[PDB]
Amino acid sequence: SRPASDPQVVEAARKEGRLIIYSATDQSSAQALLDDFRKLYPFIQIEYNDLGTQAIYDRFVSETAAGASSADLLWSSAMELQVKLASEGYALPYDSPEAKNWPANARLGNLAYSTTLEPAVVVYNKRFLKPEEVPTTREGLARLLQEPRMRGRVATWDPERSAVGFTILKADYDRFPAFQELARAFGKAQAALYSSTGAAFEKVISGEHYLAYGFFGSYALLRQRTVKDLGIAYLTDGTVAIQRVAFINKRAAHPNAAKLFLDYLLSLRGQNLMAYTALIFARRETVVGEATPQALYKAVGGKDKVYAIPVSTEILKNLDPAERMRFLTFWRQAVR
């Protein structure tokens, strides 16, 4: 039940009566959260803007620079872009009463918050690869992708075009040495490179591709409901998890509505609704559903096989020229 937002915030939110969100989260994934927020707080008109991760950063920066009305709350899997904004004066400092036991590495102090722990998984078409054929390690996937029969049948992110594709593949490269071998295997298999989870899943579902690497498990579980032939394989040699980052615009027209929504996302109710109905992999460990930390940990063989990218300024290294250059120079030569 009800998030522990202050009564004064709730009244103030009622005077605002509107809530502008910029979000990367596919609205079809996010809808159950909007619907459930509407029941808590029927008096808040929501404008959900489903936008690419890069478009959110560019939109917010230019709107802000012009004095324009922008969003009240920004929610996105592009973790570098969000931590940059939130560490540079775009964030309203708010100490959420629902985050008192958030680890220090899932919050930028009072400036920004992790709302999810979403694994980068393998999705495959069971009509072309049965489960016993899909390896669960970067080594195994590399050997599979040496098969001629797999040439043209693999998708992954374009880290040059998707800002969250950059987040995932950069974290894969920093933490798993076997990633390099796997990247070159993508070059051998003429891997096709995608700027959205949806584009890659359709191609996999159609059979144009047999296997997609590094897309959100959240989206793949939702799609599985409707597509029997869509398979999910979790990596047992190490799993990158993103934490979808939430902050309030310092210059929100409706800061208290943004506070309620943030508090909702962090609450036992939002996290449970995430795990059970939105099928978004929740941040809280005491959640019930398919999309949970406990179902991820079981799948990969323990919490210690998950590298959770922290909501920290440390990850801005990923935007420093020399760090950006080494990754993308590696990636372009590997993938060919």
Ligand X SMILES: O=S([O-])[O-]
**9 or 232: CB nearest ligand X:** 232
Burial class of residue 201 in the structure, from the number of CB atoms within 10 Å of its CB (0-12 exposed, 13-18 middle, 19+ buried): buried
**159 or 231: CB nearest ligand X:** 231
Exposure of 135 in the CB half-sphere (CA atoms within 13 A): 12
Find the shortest distance in angstroms from Cβ 58 to ligand X: 36
**178 or 295: CB nearest ligand X:** 295
Do 327 and 165 meet the contact criterion of CB atoms below 8 Å apart? no
How far is 97 from 16, CA to CA, in rounded Å? Answer: 21
Kindly state the number of chain residues that form the binding site for Mn ion, as judged by CB under 5 A.
Answer: 1
Beta-bridge partner residues of 118: 242
**215 or 264: CB nearest ligand X:** 215
**57 or 210: CB nearest Mn ion:** 57
Do 217 and 118 meet the contact criterion of CB atoms below 8 Å apart? yes
Find the shortest distance in angstroms from Cβ 128 to ligand X: 13
How far is 136 from 141, CA to CA, in rounded Å? Answer: 7
Q: Among 95, 99, 49, 103, which Cα is nearest to 76's?
A: 49
- In the chain, the N- to C-terminal Cα span, in Å, equals 52
Mark 177-216 with x for binding to ligand X (rule: CB under 6 A) and - for no binding: ----------------------------------------
How far is 219 from 225, CA to CA, in rounded Å? Answer: 10
| Contact call for residue 26 and Mn ion (CB under 5 A) | yes
How far is 235 from 245, CA to CA, in rounded Å? Answer: 23
Which residue among 86, 112, 232, 308 contacts ligand X (CB under 6 A)?
Answer: 232
232 binds, among Mn ion, ligand X, none (CB under 5 to 8 A by kind): ligand X
26 binds, among ligand X, Mn ion, none (CB under 5 to 8 A by kind): Mn ion
Which residue among 165, 231, 270, 310 contacts ligand X (CB under 6 A)?
Answer: 231
Find the shortest distance in angstroms from Cβ 26 to Mn ion: 4
Instruction: Summarize as ranges the residues that interact with Mn ion (CB under 5 A).
Output: 26
Give the interface with ligand X as residue ranges (CB under 6 A).
231-232
